[PDB]
């Protein structure tokens, strides 16, 4: 009862839209007399789980409860109005709507309406069709319900009777989506506000950009796993006894390493049932391909200028390379990760076919509807030289005519990759990418500069640790030998050279494992 | 209850009020015409249609037109099913009371709002209470012991989920369709909801509005007015949302203009296309000066073959096939614009993402459903875009269904078949070639726009926007663009347009030009497409 639009970070247009349905007709009643208005009194929250849909209703209740113009608040769970006797289910609804009419102004909040108002079908019990009919007949009927603001919250929007969604019943619909890098930082400032050792802004700014895919609840949860980790690290004897000890509340300060352990043990809620098709370069491969990622992002910026309003025409790009250059394995997911705040919808083999009781066409038809709705979006088809060889002609005819229906100036990017050059691709694909327009990117192998930094830290610093003139020669030899390896062979040779280092952890003296490195780099053969 | 609604705001529905005052008003006013022939006029209706169209508004107007009048017809109003009761025989008994109380105060009206929640179709799998309350509702509407002078009315959104024994001449002998308004009917709802305003809006402005509100239904038209007023209030006082306090605002600088009716229609989705998109869209503001004339020519050809696009106009198997080269924008820009121009005709689509896009339904079952629906509600369109591909994507069972179902249609039924193709007519298969009879006028050939069309396309962008503060060589650039882009199709044209708009965007904040004009010049010079 102490949350008042203060803890709600990242959602500011929704709150502004919400104080003109509830607050303004009470504060400025003479503006709505000039035009005879009666502003909208129906909204519908929807989105993925954890994204601030119940926090906003809580804050609005507390905002209107404490003030001059006291408003009521009636709260309902999913389907708690159901009774077993044949006339009582829809008598409790009539009772609730009439009780709210003598308290007005009031607010009726329906939490999780997915279980109250399904689409009326004959293949179910009458109890649901009767409840929906009375609900819609009571909301907007012959009686002018009055100053009652009805709100509902849901995850599954399209499973609600389409007669409830029209001006007069549920006028406005509100999308609560995952936070971007700038709202994650607001949420982090909120949840780490009354802390003894107030964290710096430059630290929260680095945290907000590492917690990609998080949503509200996940940030609030790491802000607590960090404290539990600090506690466990400071007092290891608190898990081997069954009584209260003298906990010194002064040496329990939270450090960055605790946040690191918290973020290492935790998976966000969004990618728990699925996996995201976008992943940053590992810390090993990062000093090898970030320059290529930057070049691809510049090409995108040329074709997809959403990365006066920017105007883009059929945003499309095709990343081509040789098999092994890592364009569908390291590069395109890193570009997808760099372009977060744009929702991604993959169409690849283990997604069309790796799920049954749904056709490939029914998934290809929905991943484009949802991409048109939430534009600017991305539609990801990797390895099209095989994707186009593992699909039927019905799926080709559906796909190639579903992106011909997208508006001419639709901010929807089609990103794809291939191993065979653009000329070796079949027809009907060479006409989707028009490199006269800059819709083709040709990857090339990393330069010497990058290849040296790929190996330096391994062969120089971690080479001779705790528990120096020949190592330069070894590094030069390694970089000279591998001037034509692709990426797979490069990182293979990286693990082979790191193996010897591991078997000599307990050796206090070097010069015995240097021969190991010499012979391992010598007897390492590839292909190419 | 509001006592001010009395057939004054119910714009658009005049053929229903006229049929509704000869069931209630006339047997009281002229009770000698009905005992000349001894006819006993119809005393049953059934309102139905899409959500938000004037079904309940007409009942709210009838209640007032009869209560506050000479004669005293009584009104009984029931919501979905509020006759149900907890104890055993009490659900049915209540109904009888409602019909007896109505018999003692006759003449009277009973109005069942959302009657599809009271009287479903009787099925042996559901509760016995519903199957036994339908059989007692339809035993006291028309059984022995004549009803009397009660007028029963029922309003619903699902018509075919009502027991078919109720839809009968003697229980519900008149079904009324409340469909989406057309243009002339939207420019009456608009004059009703802005009836008592300040500086009353011009009829020319209300016509400009009624043209752009396609897909709106009564409630959306009433809602855009509120949204426009709110947008104006926000535009005038931006500091009225950052105080949570009462302030002093002069109720005179808050006049509603245009550009607030225009921003309201951005964040507004009609109720009809909120879960499914219609296959008809008008030309965007960019492409319009490039293809409106082609749309008009197509509509003239339609006028020839489909006379119902102005005795009576008589037609015979109205068909047309819009052919053009690939890229000429006939199945992507033109056919939906022709569909959108022909509103007030119902439009069904038969294309791949719709046949092979929904499961648990045969592909040759939807094809049999849409043709039946189109027959039922003629004049109607059946839209098959890209038949040069549609024909090589369906099986022979679906072909034998489709070609023999468009023959079962009566000859003079105004059901139009609209299709497009990229292959010329000669390159199509025979079984399709023989469905269009060019010597009959059933083929239209598209051609590239002319110099005039291209000049008007590029003019306002190269001339009146390149200056745009945050004149003799701009016209030379315009001439060069209109020259070099003379063998392009529409995709390449509207691609060059976006390529030139990306420069102007990049050079927003530069107060001085001549860094934008040479940029423009090199961009147009470097553009290569074919
Ligand atoms: N913008 C935010 N600022 C602070 N905390 C947030 C924010 N968004 C979400 N949270 C945290 O997430 C919790 C859930 O909010 P809410 O439950 O309304 O989301 P939801 O969409 O209802 O989730 P679900 O759909 O699973 O019910 C809150 O208790 C809050 O701690
Ligand atoms: N012809 C009209 N003239 C003026 N207003 C109209 C008209 N038609 C509809 N409306 C608006 O629509 C609102 C009511 O909708 P309606 O009376 O059609 O019930 P309904 O919403 O159709 O029932 P359901 O919920 O099944 O759709 C009214 O408030 C009215 O402002």
Residue numbers in the entry:
A (entry chain C): 421 to 727, 786 to 945, 1330 to 1390
B (entry chain D): 419 to 728, 786 to 945, 1330 to 1389
Give the article text.
ATAD2 is a non-canonical ATP-dependent histone chaperone and a major cancer target. From a structural standpoint, ATAD2 exhibits a conserved multidomain architecture comprising an N-terminal acidic domain, two AAA+ ATPase domains, a bromodomain, C-terminal domain, and an exceptionally long C-terminal linker (CTL) that bridges the bromo- and C-terminal domain. Unlike most other histone chaperones that do not require ATP for activity, ATAD2 stands out due to the presence of an ATP-dependent AAA+ ATPase domain. The AAA+ domain adopts a conserved structural fold found in the AAA+ ATPase superfamily, with each monomer consisting of a large α/β nucleotide binding domain (NBD) and a small α -helical bundle domain (HBD).
However, when a specific mutation (E532Q) which specifically blocks ATP-hydrolysis was introduced into the Walker B motif, ATAD2 formed stable hexamers with homogeneous particle distributions. In the hexameric structure of ATAD2, the six subunits were arranged in a right-handed spiral with a rise of ~2 Å and a rotation of ~60 ° around the helical axis. This resulted in a “seam” between the top (herein referred to as “subunit P1”) and bottom (herein referred to as “subunit P6”) subunits with an offset of ~12 Å. Five binding pockets of AAA1 were occupied by ATP, while the binding pocket of P6 at the spiral seam (P1/P6 interface) was occupied by ADP. When comparing individual ATAD2 subunits we also discovered a conserved N-terminal linker domain (aa406-423, referred to as “LD” hereafter). This structural element was only visible in the ADP-bound subunit, P6, and was sandwiched between the two subunits at the spiral seam (subunits P1 and P6). In the ATAD2 structure, a salt bridge is formed between D415 of the N-terminal LD in P6 and R540 of pore loop 2 in P1, potentially stabilizing the P6 N-terminal LD-P1 interaction and hexamerization of ATAD2. Third, while translocating AAA+ ATPases usually have 5 to 6 subunits engaged with the substrate in the active state, only 3 ATAD2 subunits (P2-4) engaged with substrate, suggesting a “weak grip”. Second, we observe the N-terminal LD of the P6 subunit wedged between the seam subunits, where it effectively glues the P1 and P6 subunits in place, thus limiting subunit translocation and symmetry breaking. Third, only three ATAD2 pore loops maintain a weak grip on a short length of substrate in the central substrate, hinting at a non-productive or weakly-productive state if ATAD2 were to pull on substrates. Together, these lines of evidence imply that the N-terminal LD acts as a brake that maintains ATAD2 in an autoinhibited state thus preventing premature ATPase activation.
